[PDB]
Short mmCIF file of C-alpha atoms (C1' of nucleotides) and ligand atoms in Angstrom, two decimals:
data_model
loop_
_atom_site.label_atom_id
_atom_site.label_comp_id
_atom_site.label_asym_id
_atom_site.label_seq_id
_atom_site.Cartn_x
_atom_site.Cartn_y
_atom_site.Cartn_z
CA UNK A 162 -71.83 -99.71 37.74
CA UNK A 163 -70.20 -96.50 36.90
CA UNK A 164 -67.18 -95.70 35.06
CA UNK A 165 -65.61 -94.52 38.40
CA UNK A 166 -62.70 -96.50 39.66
CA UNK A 167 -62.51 -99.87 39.57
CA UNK A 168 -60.42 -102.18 37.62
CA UNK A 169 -59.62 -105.99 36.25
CA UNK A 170 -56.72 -108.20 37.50
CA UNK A 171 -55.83 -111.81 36.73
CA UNK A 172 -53.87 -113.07 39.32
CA UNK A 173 -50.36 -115.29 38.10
CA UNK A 174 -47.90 -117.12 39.92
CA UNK A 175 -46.08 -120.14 39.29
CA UNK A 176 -47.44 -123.52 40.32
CA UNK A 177 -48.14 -124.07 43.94
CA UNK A 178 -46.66 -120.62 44.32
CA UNK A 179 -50.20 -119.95 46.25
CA UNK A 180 -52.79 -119.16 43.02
CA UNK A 181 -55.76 -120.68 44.76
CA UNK A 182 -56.08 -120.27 48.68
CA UNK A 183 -54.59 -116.53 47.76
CA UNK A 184 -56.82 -115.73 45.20
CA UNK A 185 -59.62 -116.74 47.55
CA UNK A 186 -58.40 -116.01 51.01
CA UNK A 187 -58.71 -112.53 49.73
CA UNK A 188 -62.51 -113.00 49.59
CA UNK A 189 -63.61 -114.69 53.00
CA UNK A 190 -62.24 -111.02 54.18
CA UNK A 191 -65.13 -108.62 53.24
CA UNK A 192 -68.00 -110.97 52.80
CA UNK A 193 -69.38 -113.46 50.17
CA UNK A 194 -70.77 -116.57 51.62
CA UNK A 195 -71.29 -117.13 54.88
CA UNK A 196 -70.47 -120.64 56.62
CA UNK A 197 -69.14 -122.81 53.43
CA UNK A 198 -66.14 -120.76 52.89
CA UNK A 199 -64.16 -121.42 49.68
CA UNK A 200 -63.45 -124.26 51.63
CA UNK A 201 -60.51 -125.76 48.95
CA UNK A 202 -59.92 -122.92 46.81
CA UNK A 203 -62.58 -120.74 44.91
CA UNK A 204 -63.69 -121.26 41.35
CA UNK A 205 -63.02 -125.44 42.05
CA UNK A 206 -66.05 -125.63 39.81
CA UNK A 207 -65.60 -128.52 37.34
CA UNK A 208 -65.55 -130.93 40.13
CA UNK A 209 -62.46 -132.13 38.23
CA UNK A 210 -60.88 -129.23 39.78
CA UNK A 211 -61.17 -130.55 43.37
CA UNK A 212 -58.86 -133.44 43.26
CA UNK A 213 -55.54 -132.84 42.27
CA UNK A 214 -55.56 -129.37 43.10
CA UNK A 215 -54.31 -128.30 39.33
CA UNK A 216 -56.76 -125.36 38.83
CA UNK A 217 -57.73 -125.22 34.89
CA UNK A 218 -60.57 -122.76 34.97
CA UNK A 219 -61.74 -120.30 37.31
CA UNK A 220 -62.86 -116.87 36.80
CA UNK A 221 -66.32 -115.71 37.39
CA UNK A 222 -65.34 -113.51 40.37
CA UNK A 223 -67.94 -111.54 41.79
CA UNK A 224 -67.57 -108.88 44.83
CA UNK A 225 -69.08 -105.80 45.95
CA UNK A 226 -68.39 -102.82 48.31
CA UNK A 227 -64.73 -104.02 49.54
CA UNK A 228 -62.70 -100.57 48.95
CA UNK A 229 -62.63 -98.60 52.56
CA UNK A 230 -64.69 -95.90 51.50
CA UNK A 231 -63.95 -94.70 48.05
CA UNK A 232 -64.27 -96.70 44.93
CA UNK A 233 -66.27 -99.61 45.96
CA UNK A 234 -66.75 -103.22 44.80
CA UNK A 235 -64.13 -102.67 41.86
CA UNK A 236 -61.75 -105.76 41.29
CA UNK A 237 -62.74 -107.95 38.35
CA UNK A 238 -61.50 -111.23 39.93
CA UNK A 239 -59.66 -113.83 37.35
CA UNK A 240 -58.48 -117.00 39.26
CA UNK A 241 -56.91 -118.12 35.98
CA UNK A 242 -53.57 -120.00 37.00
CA UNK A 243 -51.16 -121.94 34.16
CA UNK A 244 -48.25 -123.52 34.35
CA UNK A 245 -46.75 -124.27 30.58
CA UNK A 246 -50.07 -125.92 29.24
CA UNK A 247 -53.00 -123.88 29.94
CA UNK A 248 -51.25 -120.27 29.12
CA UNK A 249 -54.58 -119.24 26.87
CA UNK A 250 -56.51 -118.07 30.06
CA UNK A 251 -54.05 -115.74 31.12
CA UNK A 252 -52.88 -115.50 27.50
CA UNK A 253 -55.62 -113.75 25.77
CA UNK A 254 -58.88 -114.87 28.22
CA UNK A 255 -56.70 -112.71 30.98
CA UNK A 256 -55.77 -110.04 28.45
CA UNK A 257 -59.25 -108.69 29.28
CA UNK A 258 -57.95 -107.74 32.69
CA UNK A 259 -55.96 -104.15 32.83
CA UNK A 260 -53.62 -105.55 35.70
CA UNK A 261 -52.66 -109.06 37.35
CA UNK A 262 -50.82 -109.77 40.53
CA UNK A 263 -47.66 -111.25 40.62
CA UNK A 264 -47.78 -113.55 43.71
CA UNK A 265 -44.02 -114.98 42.80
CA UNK A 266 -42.89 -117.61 45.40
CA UNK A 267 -40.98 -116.40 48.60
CA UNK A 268 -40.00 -119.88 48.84
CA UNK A 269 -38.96 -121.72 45.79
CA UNK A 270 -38.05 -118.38 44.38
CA UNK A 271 -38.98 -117.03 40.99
CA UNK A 272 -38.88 -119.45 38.12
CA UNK A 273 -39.12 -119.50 34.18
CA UNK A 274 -43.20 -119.24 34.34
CA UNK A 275 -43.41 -115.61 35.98
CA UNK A 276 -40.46 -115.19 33.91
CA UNK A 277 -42.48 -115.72 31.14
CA UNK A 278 -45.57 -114.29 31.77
CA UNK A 279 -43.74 -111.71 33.27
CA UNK A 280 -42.99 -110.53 29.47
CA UNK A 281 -46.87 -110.42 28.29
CA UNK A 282 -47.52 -108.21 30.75
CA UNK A 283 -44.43 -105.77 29.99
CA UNK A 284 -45.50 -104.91 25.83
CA UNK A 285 -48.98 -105.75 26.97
CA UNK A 286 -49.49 -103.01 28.67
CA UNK A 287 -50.37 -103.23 32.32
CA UNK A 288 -50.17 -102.91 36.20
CA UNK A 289 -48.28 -105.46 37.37
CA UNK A 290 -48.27 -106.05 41.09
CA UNK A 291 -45.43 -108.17 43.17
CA UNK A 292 -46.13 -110.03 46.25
CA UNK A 293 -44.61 -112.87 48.13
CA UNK A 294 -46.62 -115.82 48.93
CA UNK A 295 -46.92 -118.23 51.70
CA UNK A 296 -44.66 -116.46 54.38
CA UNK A 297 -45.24 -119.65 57.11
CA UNK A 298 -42.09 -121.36 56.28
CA UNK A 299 -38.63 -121.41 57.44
CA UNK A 300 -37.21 -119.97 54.47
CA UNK A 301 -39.65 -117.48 52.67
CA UNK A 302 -37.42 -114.04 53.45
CA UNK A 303 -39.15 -111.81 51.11
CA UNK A 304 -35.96 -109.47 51.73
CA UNK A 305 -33.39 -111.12 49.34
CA UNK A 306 -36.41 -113.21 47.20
CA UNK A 307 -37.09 -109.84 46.78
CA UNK A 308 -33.70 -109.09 44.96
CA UNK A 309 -34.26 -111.38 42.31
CA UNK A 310 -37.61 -109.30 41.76
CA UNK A 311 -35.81 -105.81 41.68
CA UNK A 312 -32.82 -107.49 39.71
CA UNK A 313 -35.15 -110.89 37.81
CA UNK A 314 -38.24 -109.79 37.93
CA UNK A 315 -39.17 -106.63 35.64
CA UNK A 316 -39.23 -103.64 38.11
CA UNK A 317 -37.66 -103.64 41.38
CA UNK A 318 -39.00 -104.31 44.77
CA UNK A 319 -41.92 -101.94 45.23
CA UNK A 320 -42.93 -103.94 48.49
CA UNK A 321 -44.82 -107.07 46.62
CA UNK A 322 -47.05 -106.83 49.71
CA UNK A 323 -45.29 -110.31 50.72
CA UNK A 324 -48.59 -111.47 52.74
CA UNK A 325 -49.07 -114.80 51.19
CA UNK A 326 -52.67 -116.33 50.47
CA UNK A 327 -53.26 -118.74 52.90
CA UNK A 328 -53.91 -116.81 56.06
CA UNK A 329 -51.50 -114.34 57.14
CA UNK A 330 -52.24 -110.64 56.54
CA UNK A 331 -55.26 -111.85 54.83
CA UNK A 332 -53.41 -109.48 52.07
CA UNK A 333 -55.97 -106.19 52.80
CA UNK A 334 -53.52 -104.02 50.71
CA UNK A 335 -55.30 -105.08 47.80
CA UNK A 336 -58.35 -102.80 48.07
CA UNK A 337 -56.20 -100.24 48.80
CA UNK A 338 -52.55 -101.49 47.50
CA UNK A 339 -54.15 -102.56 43.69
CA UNK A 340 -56.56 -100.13 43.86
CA UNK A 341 -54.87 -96.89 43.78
CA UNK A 342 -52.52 -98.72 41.97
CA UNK A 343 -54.12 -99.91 38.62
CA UNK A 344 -56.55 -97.37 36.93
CA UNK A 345 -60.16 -98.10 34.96
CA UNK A 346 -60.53 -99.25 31.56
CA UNK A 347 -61.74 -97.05 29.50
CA UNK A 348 -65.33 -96.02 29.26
CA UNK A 349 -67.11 -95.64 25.72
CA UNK A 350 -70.55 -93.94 26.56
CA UNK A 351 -71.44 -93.01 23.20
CA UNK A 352 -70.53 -95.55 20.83
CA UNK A 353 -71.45 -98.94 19.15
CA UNK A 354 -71.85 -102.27 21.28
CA UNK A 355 -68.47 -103.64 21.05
CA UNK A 356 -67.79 -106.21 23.34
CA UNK A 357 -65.34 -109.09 23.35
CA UNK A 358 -66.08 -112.04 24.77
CA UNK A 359 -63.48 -113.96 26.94
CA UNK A 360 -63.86 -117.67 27.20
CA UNK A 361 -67.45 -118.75 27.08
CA UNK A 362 -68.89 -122.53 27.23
CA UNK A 363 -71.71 -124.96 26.47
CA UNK A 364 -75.74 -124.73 26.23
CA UNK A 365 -77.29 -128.12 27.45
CA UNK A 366 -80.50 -125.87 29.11
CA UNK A 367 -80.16 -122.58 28.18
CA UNK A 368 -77.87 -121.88 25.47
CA UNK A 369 -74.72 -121.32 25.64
CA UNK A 370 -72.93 -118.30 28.43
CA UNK A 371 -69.74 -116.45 27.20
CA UNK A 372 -68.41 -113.93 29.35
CA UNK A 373 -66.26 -111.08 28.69
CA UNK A 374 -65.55 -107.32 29.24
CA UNK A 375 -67.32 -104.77 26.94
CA UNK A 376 -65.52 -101.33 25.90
CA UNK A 377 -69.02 -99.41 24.94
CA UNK A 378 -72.56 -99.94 24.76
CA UNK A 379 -74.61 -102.32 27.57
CA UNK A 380 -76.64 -105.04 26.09
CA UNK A 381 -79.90 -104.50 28.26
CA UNK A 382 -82.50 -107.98 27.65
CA UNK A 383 -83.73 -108.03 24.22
CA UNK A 384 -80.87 -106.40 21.93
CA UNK A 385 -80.52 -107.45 18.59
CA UNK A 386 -75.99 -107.79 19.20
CA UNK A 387 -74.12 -109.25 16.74
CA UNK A 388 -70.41 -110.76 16.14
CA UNK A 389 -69.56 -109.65 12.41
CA UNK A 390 -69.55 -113.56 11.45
CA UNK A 391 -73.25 -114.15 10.43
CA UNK A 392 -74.05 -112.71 13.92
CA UNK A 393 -77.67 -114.36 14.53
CA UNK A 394 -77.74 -114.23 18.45
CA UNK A 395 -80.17 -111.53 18.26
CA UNK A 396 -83.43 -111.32 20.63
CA UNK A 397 -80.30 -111.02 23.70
CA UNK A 398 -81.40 -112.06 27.23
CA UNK A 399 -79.54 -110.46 30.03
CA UNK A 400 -75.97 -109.17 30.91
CA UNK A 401 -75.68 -111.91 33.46
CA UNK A 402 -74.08 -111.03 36.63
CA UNK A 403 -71.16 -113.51 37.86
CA UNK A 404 -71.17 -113.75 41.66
CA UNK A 405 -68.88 -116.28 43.83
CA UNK A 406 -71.41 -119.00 43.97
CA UNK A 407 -73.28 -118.65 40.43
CA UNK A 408 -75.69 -116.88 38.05
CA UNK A 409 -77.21 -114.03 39.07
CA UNK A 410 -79.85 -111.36 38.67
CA UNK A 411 -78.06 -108.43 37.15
CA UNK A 412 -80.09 -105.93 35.92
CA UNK A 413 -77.86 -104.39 32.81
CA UNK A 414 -73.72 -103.70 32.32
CA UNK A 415 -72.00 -101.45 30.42
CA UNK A 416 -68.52 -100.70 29.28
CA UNK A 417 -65.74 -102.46 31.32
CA UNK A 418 -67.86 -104.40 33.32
CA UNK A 419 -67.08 -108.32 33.33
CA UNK A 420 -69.94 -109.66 32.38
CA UNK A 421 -71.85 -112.61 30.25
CA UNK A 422 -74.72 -112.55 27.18
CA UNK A 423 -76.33 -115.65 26.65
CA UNK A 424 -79.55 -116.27 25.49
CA UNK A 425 -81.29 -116.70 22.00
CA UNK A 426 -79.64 -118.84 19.39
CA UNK A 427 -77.59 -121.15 21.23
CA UNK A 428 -75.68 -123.25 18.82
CA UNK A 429 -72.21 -124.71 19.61
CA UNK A 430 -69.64 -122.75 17.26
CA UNK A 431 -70.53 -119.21 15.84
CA UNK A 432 -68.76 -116.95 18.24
CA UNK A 433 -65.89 -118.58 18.82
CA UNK A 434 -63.62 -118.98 21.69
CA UNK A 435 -65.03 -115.06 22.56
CA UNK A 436 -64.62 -112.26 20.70
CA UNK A 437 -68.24 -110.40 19.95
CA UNK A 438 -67.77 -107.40 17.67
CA UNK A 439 -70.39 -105.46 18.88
CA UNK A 440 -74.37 -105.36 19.34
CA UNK A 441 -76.26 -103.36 16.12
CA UNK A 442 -77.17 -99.73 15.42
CA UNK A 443 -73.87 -98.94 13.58
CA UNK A 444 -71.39 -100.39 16.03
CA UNK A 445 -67.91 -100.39 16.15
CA UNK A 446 -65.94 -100.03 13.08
CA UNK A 447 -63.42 -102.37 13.70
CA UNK A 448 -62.94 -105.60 14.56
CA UNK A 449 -61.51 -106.82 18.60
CA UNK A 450 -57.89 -107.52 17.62
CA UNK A 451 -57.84 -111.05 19.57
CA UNK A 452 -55.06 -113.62 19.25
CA UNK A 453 -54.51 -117.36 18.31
CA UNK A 454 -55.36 -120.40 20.43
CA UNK A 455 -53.11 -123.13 20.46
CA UNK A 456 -51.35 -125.60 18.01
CA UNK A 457 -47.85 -125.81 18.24
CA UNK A 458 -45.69 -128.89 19.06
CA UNK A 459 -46.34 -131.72 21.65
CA UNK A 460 -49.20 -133.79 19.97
CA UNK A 461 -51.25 -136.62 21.11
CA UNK A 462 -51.57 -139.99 19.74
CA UNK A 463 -55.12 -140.83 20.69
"C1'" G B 279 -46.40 -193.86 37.29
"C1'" U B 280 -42.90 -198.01 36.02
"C1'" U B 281 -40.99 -203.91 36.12
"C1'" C B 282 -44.65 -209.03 36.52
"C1'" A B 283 -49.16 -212.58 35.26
"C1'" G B 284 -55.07 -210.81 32.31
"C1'" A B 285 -56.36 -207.46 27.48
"C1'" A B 286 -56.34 -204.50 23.13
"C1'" C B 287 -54.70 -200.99 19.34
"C1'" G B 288 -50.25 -199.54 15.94
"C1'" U B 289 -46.13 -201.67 13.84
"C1'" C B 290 -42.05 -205.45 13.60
"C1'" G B 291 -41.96 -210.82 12.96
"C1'" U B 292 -43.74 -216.74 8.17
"C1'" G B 293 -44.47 -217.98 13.65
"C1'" A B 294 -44.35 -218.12 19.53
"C1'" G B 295 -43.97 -213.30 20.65
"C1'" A B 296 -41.91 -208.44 21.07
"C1'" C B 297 -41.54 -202.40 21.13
"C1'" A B 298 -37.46 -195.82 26.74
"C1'" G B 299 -45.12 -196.86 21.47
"C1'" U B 300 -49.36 -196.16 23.82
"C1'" U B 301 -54.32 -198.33 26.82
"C1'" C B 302 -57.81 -200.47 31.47
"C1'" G B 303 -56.60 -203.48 34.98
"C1'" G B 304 -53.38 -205.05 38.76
"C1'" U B 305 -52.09 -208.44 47.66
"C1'" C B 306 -47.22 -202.94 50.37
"C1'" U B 307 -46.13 -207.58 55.82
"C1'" C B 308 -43.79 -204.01 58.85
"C1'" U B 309 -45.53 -206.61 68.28
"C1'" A B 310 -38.26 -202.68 68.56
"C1'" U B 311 -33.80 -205.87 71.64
"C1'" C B 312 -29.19 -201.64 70.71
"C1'" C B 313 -27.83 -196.45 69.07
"C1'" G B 314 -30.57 -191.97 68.37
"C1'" C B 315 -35.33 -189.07 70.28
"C1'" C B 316 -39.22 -187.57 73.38
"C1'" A B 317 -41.03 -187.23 78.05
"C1'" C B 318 -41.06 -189.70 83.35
"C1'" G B 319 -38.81 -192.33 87.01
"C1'" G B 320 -35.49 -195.79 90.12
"C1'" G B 321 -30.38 -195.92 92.99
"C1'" C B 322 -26.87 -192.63 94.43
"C1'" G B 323 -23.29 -189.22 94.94
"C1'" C B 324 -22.89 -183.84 96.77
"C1'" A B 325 -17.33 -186.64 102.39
"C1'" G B 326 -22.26 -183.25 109.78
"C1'" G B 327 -29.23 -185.13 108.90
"C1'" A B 328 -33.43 -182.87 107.00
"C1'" G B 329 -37.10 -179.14 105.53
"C1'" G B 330 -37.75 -174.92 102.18
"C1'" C B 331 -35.88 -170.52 98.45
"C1'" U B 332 -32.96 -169.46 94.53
"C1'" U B 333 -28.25 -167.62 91.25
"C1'" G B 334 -27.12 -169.13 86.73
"C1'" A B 335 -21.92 -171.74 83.67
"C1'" G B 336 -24.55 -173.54 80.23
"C1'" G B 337 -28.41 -174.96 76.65
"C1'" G B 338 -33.08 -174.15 74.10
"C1'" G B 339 -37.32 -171.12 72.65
"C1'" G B 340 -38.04 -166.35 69.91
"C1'" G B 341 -36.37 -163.78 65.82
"C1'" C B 342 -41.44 -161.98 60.05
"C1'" U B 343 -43.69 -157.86 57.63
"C1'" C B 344 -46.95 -154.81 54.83
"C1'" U B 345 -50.62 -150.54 54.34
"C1'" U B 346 -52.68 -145.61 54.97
"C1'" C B 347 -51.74 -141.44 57.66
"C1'" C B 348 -48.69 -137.04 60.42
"C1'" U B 349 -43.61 -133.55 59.49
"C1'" A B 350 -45.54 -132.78 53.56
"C1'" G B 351 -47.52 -134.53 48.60
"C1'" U B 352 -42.79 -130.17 51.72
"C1'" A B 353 -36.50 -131.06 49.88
"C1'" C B 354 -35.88 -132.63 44.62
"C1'" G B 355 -39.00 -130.58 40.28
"C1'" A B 356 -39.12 -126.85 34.67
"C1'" G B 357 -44.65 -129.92 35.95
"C1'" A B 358 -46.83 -134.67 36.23
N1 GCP C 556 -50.04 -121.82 54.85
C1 GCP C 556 -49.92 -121.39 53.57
N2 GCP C 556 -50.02 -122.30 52.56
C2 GCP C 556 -49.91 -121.92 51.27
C3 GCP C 556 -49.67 -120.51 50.96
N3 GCP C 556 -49.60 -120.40 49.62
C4 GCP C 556 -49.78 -121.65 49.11
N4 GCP C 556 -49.96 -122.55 50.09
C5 GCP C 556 -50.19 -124.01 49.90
O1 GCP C 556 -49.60 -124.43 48.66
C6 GCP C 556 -50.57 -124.98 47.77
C7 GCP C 556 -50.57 -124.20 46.46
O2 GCP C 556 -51.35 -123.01 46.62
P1 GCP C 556 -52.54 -122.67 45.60
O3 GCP C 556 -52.57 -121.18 45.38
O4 GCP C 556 -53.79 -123.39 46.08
O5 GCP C 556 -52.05 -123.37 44.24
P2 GCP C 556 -52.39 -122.71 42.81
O6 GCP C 556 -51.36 -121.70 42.47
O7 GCP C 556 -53.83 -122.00 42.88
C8 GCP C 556 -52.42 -124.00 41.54
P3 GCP C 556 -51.83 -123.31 39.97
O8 GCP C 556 -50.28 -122.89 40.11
O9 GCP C 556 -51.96 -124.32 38.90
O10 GCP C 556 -52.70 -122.01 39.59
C9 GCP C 556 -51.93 -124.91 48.45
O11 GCP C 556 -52.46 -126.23 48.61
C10 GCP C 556 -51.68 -124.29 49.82
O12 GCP C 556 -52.07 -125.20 50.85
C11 GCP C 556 -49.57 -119.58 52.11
O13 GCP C 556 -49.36 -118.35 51.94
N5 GCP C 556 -49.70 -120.08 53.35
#
RNA sequence: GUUCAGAACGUCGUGAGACAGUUCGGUCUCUAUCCGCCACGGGCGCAGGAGGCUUGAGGGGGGCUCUUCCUAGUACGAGA
């Protein structure tokens, strides 16, 4: 809680490039869970997830005091990987996040997908962050990969913290290295309830969960919010507080904090992919300029 | 199965019969002399008599292959 320090980052990386073990080694380093590690990579929810290794959808993230001694637990996890399919997460679902790492191969080398991403978060507007991955193998010499970087890849060669997820440094730069490095987001104490909603999902028990970041305004349990369409998911709930395992406690969030609202009115389309204009009271005057989804070429022929 | 005799259908024939048209029936003799072959011996040679142990020309036998897993789902790949 707090608008002091802390920040959101969606880590991206081409396939394999190390967007799972990294993205997780990083937490069996402070704490969260004791024995069962992440055991195959974090957020391998889904089940699906588990074979094949080809992570689809994984954010959640959930920490707590892992800044030596000055911000604190501040670092909006977003396992949210793509690879020329799946580029909504860390298309607009990631756009949430003021800052994503760059773990671009030390290996394989940089390749059209941080390339490409590499351009959304240029006009975007955020902290990008380089860092080699996987620096076990023969040839992984983040030296001259590096080039590329400082020559290929947007800005230079500010040290990517070449550490690599699986083992190795166990990449502890990041609470310090990201930290000092990306800033917060905003605040909004005095205004309207104006969240926006990131992905969400389904009911089945209890409604339907979509999480996102809010600007202004925390939506305690039992705040009548609405989305400007209809908006009739009034009588709230709770903030919900993501953790590494699953739902939480949470008492109430605020502005910035990555959090869900579920509860009352569950329904199956009314809110959309996210998006939540704001809660009620006179609430934000505008609407949570969000993008498209998908629907371009490649069809099926079910 | 088809090539016998019995029998019937179809058709051909005035008729007995007939048809690479079908249909059911319907005795398979097989003591080996020689070559060949498989094993096993008999005489005898091996230029002193016998008892053991072997090399090997040479010849035969044998030679098949799939599946998961490791280096690694790494090189390749812009993914699967
Ligand atoms: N030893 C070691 N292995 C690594 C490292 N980085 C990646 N790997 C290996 O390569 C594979 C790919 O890493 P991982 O981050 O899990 O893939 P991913 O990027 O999350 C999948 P996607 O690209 O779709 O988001 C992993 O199975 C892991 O074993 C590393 O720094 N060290």
């Amino acid at each position: 809680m707090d608008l002091s320090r802390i920040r959101n980052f969606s880590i991206i990386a081409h396939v394999d490039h190390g967007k799972s073990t990294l993205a997780d080694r990083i937490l069996e380093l402070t704490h969260a869970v004791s024995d069962r590690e992440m055991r195959e990579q974090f957020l391998d929810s889904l089940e699906l997830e588990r074979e094949r290794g080809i992570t689809i959808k994984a954010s959640a993230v959930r920490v707590t005091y892992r800044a030596k001694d000055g911000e604190e637990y501040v670092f909006h996890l977003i396992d949210t990987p793509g690879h020329v399919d799946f580029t909504y997460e860390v298309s607009r679902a990631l756009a949430a996040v003021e800052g994503v790492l760059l773990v671009v191969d030390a290996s394989q080398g940089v390749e059209a997908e941080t390339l490409a991403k590499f351009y959304m978060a240029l006009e975007h507007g955020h902290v990008i962050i380089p860092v080699i991955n996987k620096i076990d193998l023969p040839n992984a010499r983040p030296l001259e990969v590096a080039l590329e970087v400082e020559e290929v890849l947007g800005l230079p060669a500010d040290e990517a913290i070449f550490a690599s997820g699986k083992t190795g440094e166990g990449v502890e730069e990041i609470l310090e290295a990201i930290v000092q490095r990306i800033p917060p987001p905003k605040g909004d104490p005095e205004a309207p309830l104006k969240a926006l909603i990131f992905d969400s999902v389904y009911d089945a028990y209890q409604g339907v969960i979509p999480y996102l970041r809010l600007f202004e305004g925390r939506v305690r349990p039992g705040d009548r919010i609405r989305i400007y369409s209809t908006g009739k998911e009034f009588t709230v709930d709770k903030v919900g507080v993501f953790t590494p395992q699953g739902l939480v406690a949470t008492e109430a969030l605020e502005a910035g904090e990555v959090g869900w609202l579920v509860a009352a009115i569950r329904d199956i389309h009314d809110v959309q992919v996210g998006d939540t204009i704001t809660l009620a009271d006179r609430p934000t005057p505008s609407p949570y300029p969000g993008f498209r989804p998908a629907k371009p070429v490649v069809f099926a022929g079910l």
